[PDB]
Design a protein around this ligand. Structure first.
Ligand code: HVE
Length: 338
């Protein structure tokens, strides 16, 4: 049994020469040399079995990533676990090793307009596929966008993903939410469970703005402060957009606020390409019904040098704890010897 920081990282003999990368959700991540396909790979250890939510998130992601096949979505190459349910305490998921991620790049590197355009293209191309499978990612953020040494981008972490369900999107005001605060669309705080595709477009809009300045556009410090930040830039919603919020608590909150004018994108981002700011505006629309969709975003003039719908594939088909361990066991069976 291999050890790393005095903890079992039980992946051999196929995977050897381990290095600590970091700490993920529910366990440790390492690189390792794959002795079959002669390359280093990423391996993440997952120890979810005592809890409903770790099991749920682990299973959702395994099911999604095994069904998906797309250049801009991280795949699962292998899954390592014990041969019996009784002996299975951990699962190791083996994935392409990626040099970096957009979070690390944004903290250390200025991005040329050409890199921003390419990164955005790849994000939307992966998102087109996800959405075509009727799946919502629901936690798009720079740390979930992996990049290799040649700037190929892959979307990862499908632990919070859901099948879209627009007919049950509605909820009350200030309803709790799980996904990462700075990338939450305004409607989450007002009247939305985050069950429509427009939730992911908001996040991508936030990511684009962050690529333009290396700083998050809406860095809220707590639940309702997130809405403070959004309205600070977009300004007060129009009567028409306010009329779409039927719930009185949410409507009246918005009516209580002093008038705020829109901050022009070209003043917030003076060196940005004007076409990038037109697309940013359309992704960061307050009203989710008026927000641009993924396939429209791909067709935007900013992305004209890459847009090719014939090369932007879609999915072939749409999509207690004891039973969840059995379901994770069954779902990983295809990777066992025989
Ligand atoms: N949220 C970003 C982290 C970076 C570390 N870590 C990885 N590091 C290298 N290559 C990888 N491939 C798949 C995952 C991964 C897990 C995700």
């Amino acid at each position: 049994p291999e050890m790393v920081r005095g903890q079992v990282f039980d992946v051999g003999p196929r995977y050897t020469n381990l290095s600590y990368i970091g700490e993920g959700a529910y366990g440790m991540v390492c690189s390792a040399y794959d002795n079959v396909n002669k390359v280093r790979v990423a391996i993440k250890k997952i120890s979810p079995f005592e809890h409903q939510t770790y099991c749920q998130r682990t299973l959702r992601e395994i099911k999604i990533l095994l069904r998906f096949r797309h250049e801009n979505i991280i795949g699962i190459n292998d899954i390592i676990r014990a041969p019996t349910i009784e002996q299975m305490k951990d699962v190791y998921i083996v994935q392409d090793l990626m040099e970096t991620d957009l979070y690390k790049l944004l903290k250390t590197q200025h991005l040329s307009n050409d890199h921003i355009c390419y990164f955005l293209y790849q994000i939307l191309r992966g998102l087109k596929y996800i959405h075509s499978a009727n799946v919502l990612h629901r936690d798009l953020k720079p740390s979930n966008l992996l990049l290799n040494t040649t700037c190929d981008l892959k979307i990862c972490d499908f632990g919070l993903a859901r099948v879209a369900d627009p007919d049950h999107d509605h909820t009350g005001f200030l309803t709790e939410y799980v996904a990462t605060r700075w990338y939450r669309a305004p409607e989450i705080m007002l009247n939305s469970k985050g069950y429509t595709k427009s939730i992911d477009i908001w996040s991508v809009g936030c990511i684009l703005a962050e690529m333009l300045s290396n700083r998050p556009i809406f860095p809220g410090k707590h639940y309702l402060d997130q809405l403070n930040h959004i309205l600070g830039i977009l300004g007060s919603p129009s009567q028409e957009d306010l009329n779409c919020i039927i719930n009185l608590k949410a409507r009246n909150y918005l009516l209580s606020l002093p008038h705020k004018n829109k901050v022009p994108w070209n003043r917030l981002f003076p060196n940005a390409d004007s076409k990038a700011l037109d697309l940013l505006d359309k992704m960061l629309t307050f009203n989710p019904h008026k927000r641009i969709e993924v396939e429209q975003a791909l067709a935007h003039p900013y992305l004209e040098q890459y847009y090719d719908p014939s090369d932007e594939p879609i999915a072939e088909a749409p999509f207690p704890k004891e039973k969840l361990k059995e379901l994770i066991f069954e779902e990983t069976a295809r990777f066992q010897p025989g």
